[PDB]
Amino acid sequence: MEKNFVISDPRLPDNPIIFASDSFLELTEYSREEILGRNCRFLQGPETDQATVQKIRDAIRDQREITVQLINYTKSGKKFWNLFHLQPMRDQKGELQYFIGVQLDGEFIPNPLLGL
Numbered sequence: 001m002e003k004n005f006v007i008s009d010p011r012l013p014d015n016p017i018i019f020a021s022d023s024f025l026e027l028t029e030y031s032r033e034e035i036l037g038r039n040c041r042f043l044q045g046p047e048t049d050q051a052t053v054q055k056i057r058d059a060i061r062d063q064r065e066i067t068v069q070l071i072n073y074t075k076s077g078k079k080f081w082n083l084f085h086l087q088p089m090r091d092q093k094g095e096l097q098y099f100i101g102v103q104l105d106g107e108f109i110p111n112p113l114l115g116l
């Protein structure tokens, strides 16, 4: 199963990605050494809806599941639609340890419906 996913560690500064799957690398055109330690926002760009980024911010603050459709950018500047499901994962004692993200490439909901 081709699974594009990244993991972030929130107990380190600015929630850096600590692991990215090969499907995520092949999708974003970045090398594995070019993503680790960075916040995922670098995929964002001029066309990224800031109102959607704000929702991701609230979901991380409140540590709950969210699903959003975003526009991200590859290393070479290409423009794709990212269907992204964010989800917390906690240790045995109920403390947040990581965030996992699951990506998907394609224009699922048409943009005129997403703008309303």
Ligand SMILES: *[C@@]12=NC3=[C]C([C])=C([C])[C]=C3N([C][C]([O])[C]([O])[C]([O])[C]OP([O])([O])=O)C1=NC(=O)[N]C2=O
Binding pocket: 006, 007, 008, 015, 039, 040, 041, 043, 044, 053, 054, 056, 057, 060, 070, 072, 082, 084, 086, 099, 100, 101, 103
């Ligand atoms: C990004 N994937 C992604 C994966 C995880 C596990 C997490 C926690 C976040 C993301 N983001 C969002 C980014 O890291 C950040 O949380 C948001 O931009 C909001 O933060 P700020 O402080 O800037 O408002 C992802 N963002 C993307 O654009 N693409 C992903 O694949």
